[PDB]
Amino acid sequence: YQIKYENGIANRGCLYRLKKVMDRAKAGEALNIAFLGGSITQGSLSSKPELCYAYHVYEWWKKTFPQADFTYINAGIGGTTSQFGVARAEADLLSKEPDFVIIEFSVNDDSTEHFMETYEGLVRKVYTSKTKPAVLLVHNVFYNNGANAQLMHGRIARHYNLPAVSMQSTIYPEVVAGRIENREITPDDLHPNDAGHALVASVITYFLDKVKTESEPDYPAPLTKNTYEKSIRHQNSDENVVCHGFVADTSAQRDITDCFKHGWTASKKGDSITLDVEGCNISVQYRKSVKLPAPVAEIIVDGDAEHAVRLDANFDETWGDKLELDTILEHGENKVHKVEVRLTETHENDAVPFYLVSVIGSSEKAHH
Numbered sequence: 001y002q003i004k005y006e007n008g009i010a011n012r013g014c015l016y017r018l019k020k021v022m023d024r025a026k027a028g029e030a031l032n033i034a035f036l037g038g039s040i041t042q043g044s045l046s047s048k049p050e051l052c053y054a055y056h057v058y059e060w061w062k063k064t065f066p067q068a069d070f071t072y073i074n075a076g077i078g079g080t081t082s083q084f085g086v087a088r089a090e091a092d093l094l095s096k097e098p099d100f101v102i103i104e105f106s107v108n109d110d111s112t113e114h115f116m117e118t119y120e121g122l123v124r125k126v127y128t129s130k131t132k133p134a135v136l137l138v139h140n141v142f143y144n145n146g147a148n149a150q151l152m153h154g155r156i157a158r159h160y161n162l163p164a165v166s167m168q169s170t171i172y173p174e175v176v177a178g179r180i181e182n183r184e185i186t187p188d189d190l191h192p193n194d195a196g197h198a199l200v201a202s203v204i205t206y207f208l209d210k211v212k213t214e215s216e217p218d219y220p221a222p223l224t225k226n227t228y229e230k231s232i233r234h235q236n237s238d239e240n241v242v243c244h245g246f247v248a249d250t251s252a253q254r255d256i257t258d259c260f261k262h263g264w265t266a267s268k269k270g271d272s273i274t275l276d277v278e279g280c281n282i283s284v285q286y287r288k289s290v291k292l293p294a295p296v297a298e299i300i301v302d303g304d305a306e307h308a309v310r311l312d313a314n315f316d317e318t319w320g321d322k323l324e325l326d327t328i329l330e331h332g333e334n335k336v337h338k339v340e341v342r343l344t345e346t347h348e349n350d351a352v353p354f355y356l357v358s359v360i361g362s363s364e365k366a367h368h
């Protein structure tokens with residue numbers, strides 16, 4: 001095969017920030033190389049952490065700039081979207097003072113206006129954060145059908161003049177034309193293997209090399225309503241929570257990928273919990289279990305039980321446990337909402353309790 005590497009540049013965008021980081025590296029300054037994304041970012045399905053695309057991109061920094069000391073920050077969580085991204089950014093990413101940030105959610109986000117709005121939220125938050133990090137957008141692709149959410153994420157790239165590289169216009173063209181058999185690079189047509197992770201990294205480092213061998217724009221108003229830029233996770237540390245059957249999980253979290261932590265568990269019908277959550281948007285995080293059967297809960301917003309949403313922890317997929325996030329209220333009134341979660345169905349043979357991870361309250365941050 002030969003990849004057309006130039007087809008990787010989905011957007012050139014403004015290189016001011018990224019070149020400024022390269023200049024700091026040349027000056028021997030310590031730099032923080034971060035990655036925020038889904039399963040591919042975390043490192044699925046590499047044989048070792050060191051062979052995932054993120055670590056490859058990190059080694060590119062090390063090798064190209066030996067005079068600088070680089071820190072690797074992998075904030076990937078499998079089976080999660082930019083909606084979770086924007087809520088966890090502060091804890092998992094911005095609190096480690098990133099200088100380079102790759103955002104990788106283009107095969108986790110659906111290509112819908114909802115995720116254009118959450119992705120914008122995420123992008124605005126990260127770009128205007130304290131360390132003013134260089135942001136590169138990375139668009140993976142589904143190798144079964146050539147799909148991604150790049151239509152929605154691209155619009156945001158061009159809006160903020162962010163660089164963006166895509167595997168949809170580099171790797172997938174090779175695969176669809178027969179020049180690459182799928183199983184050489186991915187066992188399941190989504191997650192790269194060792195070869196695939198090296199290939200994905202190579203499309204990124206091509207761009208990075210191009211930048212090296214070669215002041216930032218006005219900050220635009222948001223393209224969308226942008227009502228997720230301020231996303232607050234309410235977990236088992238929040239006061240204002242009153243448990244009625246739900247008990248807080250006090251167990252220690254090994255890393256961010258140990259994602260059923262800092263929340264609450266319940267086992268008995270009628271077990272409930274109430275939260276005060278401020279925002280115009282309300283979303284809820286819970287476990288969908290591969291181990292069946294499991295409880296079913298409903299979530300009620302502002303006492304409106306007639307229009308409650310079913311949270312079924314009986315996963316209908318078989319790959320593993322999912323950290324689900326459902327949007328329950330969107331573009332409501334911005335205020336403190338009452339949120340209740342209660343178990344509506346249980347089974348004598350339930351293999352796991354219901355795990356409520358978080359409830360997220362979201363609203364816009366004012367543009368100036």
Ligand SMILES: OC[C@H]1O[C@@H](O[C@H]2[C@H](O)[C@H](O)[C@H](O[C@H]3[C@H](O)[C@H](O)[C@H](O[C@H]4[C@H](O)[C@H](O)[C@H](O)O[C@@H]4CO)O[C@@H]3CO)O[C@@H]2CO)[C@@H](O)[C@@H](O)[C@@H]1O
Pocket residue numbers: 038039040042044045046077078079080107108109188190191317319320
């Ligand atoms: O949502 C869009 C798309 O998603 C599809 O489901 C994906 C899901 O998005 C996610 O990428 C998931 O990743 C899994 C992966 O397949 C393995 O199960 C992986 O495993 C790891 C395990 O959890 C341990 O950490 C172990 O130590 O290491 C393993 C990796 O070596 O876990 C990942 C989650 O972190 O894969 C599924 C399916 O591919 C589908 O829902 C599809 O319909 C949809 O369009």
